[PDB]
Every structure is written in structure tokens, then in C-alpha cells.
Write a protein that binds this ligand. Structure first.
Ligand SMILES: [NH3+]c1ncnc2c1ncn2[C@@H]1O[C@@H]2CO[P@@](=O)(S)O[C@H]3[C@@H](F)[C@H](n4cnc5c([NH3+])ncnc54)O[C@@H]3CO[P@@](=O)(S)O[C@H]2[C@H]1F
Lengths: 170, 170
């Protein structure tokens, strides 16, 4: 239903555009090294806090990648930026990677709360699971995703940093 | 159907966020003046060229507004930028305004071409008309839209610059 559209919008408007020019931006920042893949958190509870340092203290913002720009729909130099986070484990730099949330989930949440949107608060977990399934099916035959993307879906004590680290070691 | 989701995504992810901080960015650039409203082109043929200077030569890029940033879904300083265009009429500066296309239309087009998206090329005109209707209904009770937004839907000789100018003089 609704999630299907957002997942294609999330691919045609973002992933399809920044994933090709992604390793260049990492190989540029590198010159502890950063990992070559964009890690997309996919909480099925649709809990997307803007500050990534609140879901887990062991997730530390480090720096930004070099910006990417592109004229898009009449906006000269529309710019895509991505935050580099390092993940701690017992006070130890255990990883470093470009980590971010899948914004469309935050939209599904913020969309349900509105009355005029006709979107129930109970469907939030199904649309999330439909957003991940539709997204992973897209990336499954995505030439833009030439092994440079890692989807991290999860539900909920819990350690998000351990969840990202687990996918890092692979 | 699909367009309904994109229109709420287009409001919760963009309009709801930049429209409040919009007049400040204009009143800042001003200090020929720029108009206080964001003008959103809504072509029902879903023809959204990235370079706005191609649909009409009398639409001239002028400058960018001051950027807006906000931590969004774990991206430190995600930045929203908006291009200032001036519109010519018989080689005469006839207007100046922050003019842009509604990117989700460009998505509906680029979404139809994919086979895995299950979106026909014939539904493109209905989903466009559903995107405008759903969007204008949102802005109709949008406190964020305190008379600072102007929707410009149109179909197709034709002069886009005349179409924007017509809404400017009101
Ligand atoms: N500056 C700028 N200019 C014009 N339009 C903008 C815009 N900022 C938001 N919008 C409008 O909002 C729609 C939905 O926005 P939202 O955020 S809820 O979801 C996005 C997001 F998930 C992802 N995305 C793209 N850039 C990203 C960056 N920097 N960081 C993280 N995510 C990114 O792509 C989805 C769809 O993007 P669209 O462009 S197809 O439609 C977008 C677009 F119409």
C-alpha cells in the first residue's frame, strides 16, 4: 500500500543517485578508514530520532562526507550529504561507517498521526515491513547497488550499536 | 493510490519543514525584490526537467536563497536549498520568485518506466492529478502554509513563464 510508493521514491530520489557516486566520496575522505558501504537503519517500530546519538550512546558522529550536488527539478545544486559515525564497544573504536536512518519510516510515523492522511497507527508495523521488503527487492536487481548498501532492519534491553557492528563484520 | 503517499511525503518531508523558515530566508536575501512565496510547478504531463531554463528560456536562474539545515534521520546538517528565478517577458524583468518543480512528479514518471514498480505509463496523468488534489487539500488546512505557497498545475504552443507570471500577479 502506502509503503510501496515511498520505497520507490526512496530509491529513485536518493539511492539511485548517491550510491554510484558513493565510493568516490569515501575514497576521498579516507585520503582509521571508513567502510565502503552506506548502512541504512530500518527500525520496524518506525522510531527514527533525528539525532542518531540518542538511540545508542556508543554511536558517535565523526564527520561529514564530501557533499554531492546535482540540479534536481529546477533546484540548482541540490546537495546530498551523509554523516560518518563511528561505533563504540566497551569504550573502543569498533567501527566507522556512513550510517543513517531510512527517512521514509519517519514519514510513515509522522504520516499516521495526521487525521487527513487516512493512515492508521496500527498499520505502522505492516507498512514498515512492507517498506523493507519492497526496498530489498529493488536493491536485489539494482545495478546502482553494486555491493555498496547494507539494510539493517530490527525490532525491540537492546543495543543498536551491536546491531550495526554485527552487519559491519561481514 | 501511489500519488497519495508521495504527496504526504512531499509535505511531511519538505513543505512542513521549509515553509515556516521561508520568509526569513527571503527577507534575508532581499537585505528588484524577491516574492514572499514558494512557487511549485505541477505539470500534469509529469515532465520535470532538472534545468528549469529548458522548459522556457524566459525563466532565468538568478541566485540561491540562504541554505536551511536540520539534523534529519541521523544526517547531521541535512540542508534544503532553493533556487531564485526571474521571469522575462519580451526581454523585460517581469518577476522574481523562488520557483521549483514538484520533484515527486518526476518520481512518478521515473517510477512508471521500471518494470518491478507495477506502475503503468497510462496512469501517469491520473496520479499527477491525484498528487495535486491531495497536495492542495493538505495545504488547505496547513498551518505551515500561512499564505506562503502557490501551486501551479498545468497541461499542454505554450509559455510556462506566462503561466508563472499569471499567478505572480495575484
Ligand atoms: N532539498 C529538497 N529539494 C527538493 N525536494 C525536497 C528536498 N528535500 C525534500 N524534498 C521533497 O521531499 C520529498 C520526500 O522527502 P523525504 O525525505 S520524506 O524522503 C526522501 C528521503 F528519504 C530520500 N532523500 C533524498 N535526499 C535525501 C537526503 N539528503 N537525505 C536523506 N534522504 C534523502 O529520498 C526520499 C524522496 O526524495 P524525493 O526527492 S523523490 O522527494 C522529496 C522531495 F520532493
Amino acid at each position: 500500500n502506502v509503503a510501496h510508493g515511498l520505497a520507490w521514491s526512496y530509491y529513485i530520489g536518493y539511492l539511485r543517485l548517491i550510491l554510484p557516486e558513493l565510493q568516490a566520496r569515501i575514497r576521498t575522505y579516507n585520503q582509521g578508514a571508513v567502510s565502503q558501504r552506506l548502512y541504512i537503519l530500518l527500525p520496524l517500530d518506525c522510531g527514527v530520532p533525528d539525532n542518531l546519538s540518542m538511540a545508542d550512546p556508543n554511536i558517535r558522529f565523526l564527520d561529514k562526507l564530501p557533499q554531492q550536488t546535482g540540479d534536481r527539478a529546477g533546484i540548482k545544486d541540490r546537495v546530498y550529504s551523509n554523516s560518518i559515525y563511528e561505533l563504540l564497544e566497551n569504550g573502543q573504536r569498533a567501527g566507522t561507517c556512513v550510517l543513517e536512518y531510512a527517512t521514509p519510516l519517519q514519514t510513515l510515523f509522522a504520516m499516521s498521526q495526521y487525521s487527513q492522511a487516512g493512515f492508521s497507527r496500527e498499520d505502522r508495523l505492516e507498512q514498515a515491513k512492507l517498506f523493507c521488503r519492497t526496498l530489498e527487492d529493488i536493491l536485489a536487481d539494482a545495478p546502482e547497488s553494486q555491493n555498496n548498501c547494507r539494510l539493517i532492519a530490527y525490532q525491540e534491553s537492546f543495543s543498536l550499536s551491536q546491531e550495526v557492528l554485527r552487519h559491519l563484520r561481514q
